[PDB]
Amino acid sequence: MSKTLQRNRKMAMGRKKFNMDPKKGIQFLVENELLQNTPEEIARFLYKGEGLNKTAIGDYLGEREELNLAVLHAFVDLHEFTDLNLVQALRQFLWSFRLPGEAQKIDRMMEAFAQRYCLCNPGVFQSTDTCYVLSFAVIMLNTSLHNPNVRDKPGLERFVAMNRGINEGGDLPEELLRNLYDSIRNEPFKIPEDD
Ligand SMILES: Cc1cc(O)cc(C)c1NS(=O)(=O)c1ccccc1
Numbered sequence: 001m002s003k004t005l006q007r008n009r010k011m012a013m014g015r016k017k018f019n020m021d022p023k024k025g026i027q028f029l030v031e032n033e034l035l036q037n038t039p040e041e042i043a044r045f046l047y048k049g050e051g052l053n054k055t056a057i058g059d060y061l062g063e064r065e066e067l068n069l070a071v072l073h074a075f076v077d078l079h080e081f082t083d084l085n086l087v088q089a090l091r092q093f094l095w096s097f098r099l100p101g102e103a104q105k106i107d108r109m110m111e112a113f114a115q116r117y118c119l120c121n122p123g124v125f126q127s128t129d130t131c132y133v134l135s136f137a138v139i140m141l142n143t144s145l146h147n148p149n150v151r152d153k154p155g156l157e158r159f160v161a162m163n164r165g166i167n168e169g170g171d172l173p174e175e176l177l178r179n180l181y182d183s184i185r186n187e188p189f190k191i192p193e194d195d
Pocket of ligand 1: 097106
């Protein structure tokens with residue numbers, strides 16, 4: 001009983017430590033046998049995200065060292081994108097962490113996302129590059145449609161034109177692009193606040 005109560009408080013302390021500095025928080029949890037030091041177990045901890053700031057989760061997933069890269073891979077693997085369209089998948093992924101203005105880190109994260117989306121849905125995009133480019137197209141479209149600071153609201157026809165030639169030199173099916181455009185137009189991305 002006393003061991004359990006002590007462990008519960010130390011877990012809570014570990015979460016607070018993580019929010020101050022992700023690597024120190026994970027270190028405390030691992031060193032106190034509250035979390036196993038495996039990429040999969042760390043990833044599951046971050047995916048659950050209990051009491052964890054989404055900016056802190058993003059920071060940890062964005063680190064360059066081997067273990068953090070492995071955690072990123074395992075974290076993306078916890079996402080189940082089978083039979084979801086690209087927007088549905090992005091809604092889930094983009095809600096799970098936050099990391100603005102770190103280009104190289106976002107590149108790694110979005111490449112991992114694109115690879116996972118395509119593995120889950122092999123018939124949609126034959127090229128993962130197509131998936132990556134279209135993923136950013138949808139993010140850009142969300143901002144263009146829903147941020148009043150941009151006065152050019154691109155219509156469907158413009159969105160279609162902007163994506164020409166990215167499907168192995170051909171175009172994406174028009175209905176795929178329409179479905180993605182309409183999904184974003186009717187429901188903006190829910191993006192985690194800076195926490
Ligand atoms: C997805 C998003 C869109 C925004 O308009 C603002 C933010 C903070 C986010 N999150 S974001 O971490 O900056 C980001 C994640 C993945 C790709 C691009 C950006």
